[PDB]
Amino acid sequence: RPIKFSTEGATSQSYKQFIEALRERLRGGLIHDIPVLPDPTTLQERNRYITVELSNSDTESIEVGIDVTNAYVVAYRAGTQSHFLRDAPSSASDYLFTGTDQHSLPFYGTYGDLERWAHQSRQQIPLGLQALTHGISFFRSGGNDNEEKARTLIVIIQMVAEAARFRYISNRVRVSIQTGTAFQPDAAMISLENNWDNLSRGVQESVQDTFPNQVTLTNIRNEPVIVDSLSHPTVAVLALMLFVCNP
Numbered sequence: 001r002p003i004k005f006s007t008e009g010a011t012s013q014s015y016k017q018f019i020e021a022l023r024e025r026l027r028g029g030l031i032h033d034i035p036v037l038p039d040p041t042t043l044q045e046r047n048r049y050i051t052v053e054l055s056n057s058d059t060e061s062i063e064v065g066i067d068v069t070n071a072y073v074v075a076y077r078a079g080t081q082s083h084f085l086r087d088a089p090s091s092a093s094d095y096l097f098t099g100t101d102q103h104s105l106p107f108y109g110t111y112g113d114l115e116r117w118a119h120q121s122r123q124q125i126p127l128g129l130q131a132l133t134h135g136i137s138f139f140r141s142g143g144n145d146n147e148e149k150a151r152t153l154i155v156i157i158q159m160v161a162e163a164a165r166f167r168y169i170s171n172r173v174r175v176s177i178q179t180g181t182a183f184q185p186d187a188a189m190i191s192l193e194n195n196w197d198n199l200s201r202g203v204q205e206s207v208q209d210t211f212p213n214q215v216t217l218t219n220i221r222n223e224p225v226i227v228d229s230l231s232h233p234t235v236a237v238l239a240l241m242l243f244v245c246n247p
């Protein structure tokens with residue numbers, strides 16, 4: 001029962017509905033009124049991995065497998081063949097795409113390794129409906145180009161997983177789809193991606209609404225904004241937290 005998103009005639013609303021469905025499946029609870037992913041140590045492995053279907057048409061689609069403990073993309077599938085990130089958890093292949101031939105990709109799923117293999121940083125790689133359409137077609141074609149494999153995963157990871165995590169990012173992608181205008185992730189988006197764990201930890205370890213360790217983000221105007229409390233307006237950007245601790 002994959003959660004589905006189609007690029008064909010995609011709209012602001014259809015993308016929003018996709019992210020909302022993904023967020024609702026990923027949610028394991030609320031901490032300080034903010035959704036949090038499940039604690040991996042008490043999660044049953046049969047409940048750990050979910051699939052998203054990304055389609056360009058009724059006859060051109062791929063699937064991506066997601067670890068609900070951290071919203072990580074750990075694998076993708078085209079037809080009878082699947083491909084797992086080098087650092088996919090051992091159990092991922094026991095539950096995802098088990099009726100396929102499962103291959104191991106040569107790169108880790110980290111931005112560091114993906115950017116290394118793509119020979120491009122996140123800042124350089126366009127996001128938006130055309131980028132996603134192009135990536136779906138590339139994975140469905142089965143092309144062996146590892147540079148484009150890494151670039152394509154950078155696109156999918158941000159338009160699916162980072163979008164699920166951050167309201168700022170889902171909205172930015174929604175605008176791209178609405179307007180038909182591709183975009184490069186801005187410094188605010190990059191800083192959110194880079195600080196998800198730190199923000200999740202700040203919220204969940206907060207004492208009287210104040211973070212034990214402060215978090216430095218960058219704002220839409222390339223200015224650095226310090227976040228140290230639950231009341232910081234930038235905290236409203238968190239749609240899903242990584243589980244760190246119960247408060």
Ligand SMILES: Nc1ncnc2[nH]cnc12
Pocket residue numbers: 071072073074109110111157161162
């Ligand atoms: N593979 C991945 N999936 C989701 N978020 C990520 N952030 C960095 N790598 C990621």
